[PDB]
Design an enzyme around this catalytic site. Structure first.
Site, PDB file in Angstrom:
ATOM      1  N   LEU A 180      30.574  -6.083  71.383  1.00  0.00           N
ATOM      2  CA  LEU A 180      31.667  -5.337  72.166  1.00  0.00           C
ATOM      3  C   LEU A 180      32.904  -6.138  72.239  1.00  0.00           C
ATOM      4  CD1 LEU A 180      29.149  -3.546  74.568  1.00  0.00           C
ATOM      5  CD2 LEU A 180      30.541  -2.357  73.053  1.00  0.00           C
ATOM      6  N   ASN A 185      37.438  -9.961  69.598  1.00  0.00           N
ATOM      7  CA  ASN A 185      37.313 -11.631  69.022  1.00  0.00           C
ATOM      8  C   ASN A 185      36.030 -11.782  68.548  1.00  0.00           C
ATOM      9  OD1 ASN A 185      40.048 -11.759  70.253  1.00  0.00           O
ATOM     10  ND2 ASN A 185      39.354 -13.127  71.877  1.00  0.00           N
ATOM     11  N   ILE A 192      19.627 -11.535  71.148  1.00  0.00           N
ATOM     12  CA  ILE A 192      19.449 -12.957  71.615  1.00  0.00           C
ATOM     13  C   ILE A 192      20.447 -12.960  72.975  1.00  0.00           C
ATOM     14  CG2 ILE A 192      19.865 -15.482  71.615  1.00  0.00           C
ATOM     15  CD1 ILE A 192      19.430 -15.167  68.465  1.00  0.00           C
ATOM     16  N   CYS A 242      21.576 -22.337  88.128  1.00  0.00           N
ATOM     17  CA  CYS A 242      20.365 -21.748  87.209  1.00  0.00           C
ATOM     18  C   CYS A 242      19.381 -22.668  86.710  1.00  0.00           C
ATOM     19  CB  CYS A 242      20.714 -21.176  85.820  1.00  0.00           C
ATOM     20  SG  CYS A 242      21.449 -19.607  85.848  1.00  0.00           S
TER      21      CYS A 242
END
EC number: 2.1.1.-
Length: 277
Positions: free
Chosen positions: A83, A86, A124, A254
């Protein structure tokens, strides 16, 4: 939401040279982040029973590293969906760069708009790609009898599972997930592994036990974090201190919740009934 867009140049200040924005695979453990990112691409492709002349679909094809590796290693045609304009532009050049007769195509679009037969599918951490039943139905239907797919995704645990580690940490983790899905991946969602597996099954796929990548993500996140930090001023100049702080919170947080076993990252393999043994 579009307040949370960050330019590609910022990501460049924390990621390895391939610009890979997903869990690396440190096997062996001494691999550099860049080598480990190629090792993660190989880990996914080696699951897919890919043979020359087949067509591989890459859903969320990033900067095109996976597709290039597939062509070079497996002598396959590739189709990538992204989407990002670039990313699309880069992928086309990456793939035109390859010395091959194989067909290579990148489409600026989501999987919802994809309905062409392909042999295998890799996806991925495709955060930009509710819709789960439709996704797995589509993936099943576009593959042949021996089709296989891998999906690598960060995952959360159901609130029930989270409560078993104690309430304090379950509310803390839910807030942090809300942060990921608001400020880092706006409008994102982190499925659980069980969702990933059971949606695949409802679609007709055989689903062996998912591979946990948790310790590899801890390492990736540590390297990313130390690297972004090492570039603080340069990062701040390129966006703001606000964006820098947000990404340090993300990266360090995280690493923390992965270490505490409140987040996971699963590489799930989906096999059609006729998949080779």
């Amino acid at each position: 939401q579009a307040h949370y867009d960050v330019s590609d140049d910022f990501f460049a200040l924390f990621q390895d040279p391939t610009r890979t924005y997903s869990c690396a695979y440190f096997e062996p453990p001494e691999l550099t982040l860049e080598e480990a990112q190629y090792a993660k691409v190989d880990l996914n492709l080696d699951k897919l029973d890919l043979k020359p002349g087949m067509t591989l679909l890459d859903i969320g094809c990033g900067w095109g590293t996976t597709m290039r590796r597939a062509v070079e290693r497996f002598d396959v045609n590739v189709i990538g969906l992204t989407l990002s304009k670039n990313q699309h532009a880069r992928c086309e050049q990456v793939l035109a760069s390859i010395d091959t007769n194989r067909s290579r195509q990148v489409l600026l679009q989501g999987w919802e708009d994809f309905a062409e037969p392909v042999d295998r599918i890799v996806s991925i951490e495709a955060f930009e790609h509710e819709n789960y039943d439709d996704f797995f139905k589509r993936c099943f239907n576009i593959m042949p009898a021996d089709g296989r797919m891998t999906v690598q995704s960060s995952v959360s645990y159901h609130p029930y599972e989270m409560a078993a580690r104690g309430k304090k940490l379950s509310f803390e983790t839910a807030r942090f997930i809300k942060f990921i899905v608001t400020e880092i991946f706006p409008g994102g969602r982190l499925p659980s592994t069980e969702m990933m597996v059971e949606h695949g099954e409802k679609a007709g796929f055989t689903v062996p036990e998912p591979l946990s990548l948790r310790p590899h993500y801890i390492k990736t996140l540590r390297i990313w974090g130390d690297t972004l930090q090492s570039n603080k001023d340069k990062a701040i100049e390129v966006t703001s201190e606000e964006v820098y702080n947000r990404y340090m919170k993300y990266l360090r947080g995280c690493e923390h919740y992965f270490t505490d076993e409140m987040l996971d990252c699963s590489l799930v393999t989906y096999l059609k009934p006729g998949a080779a043994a």
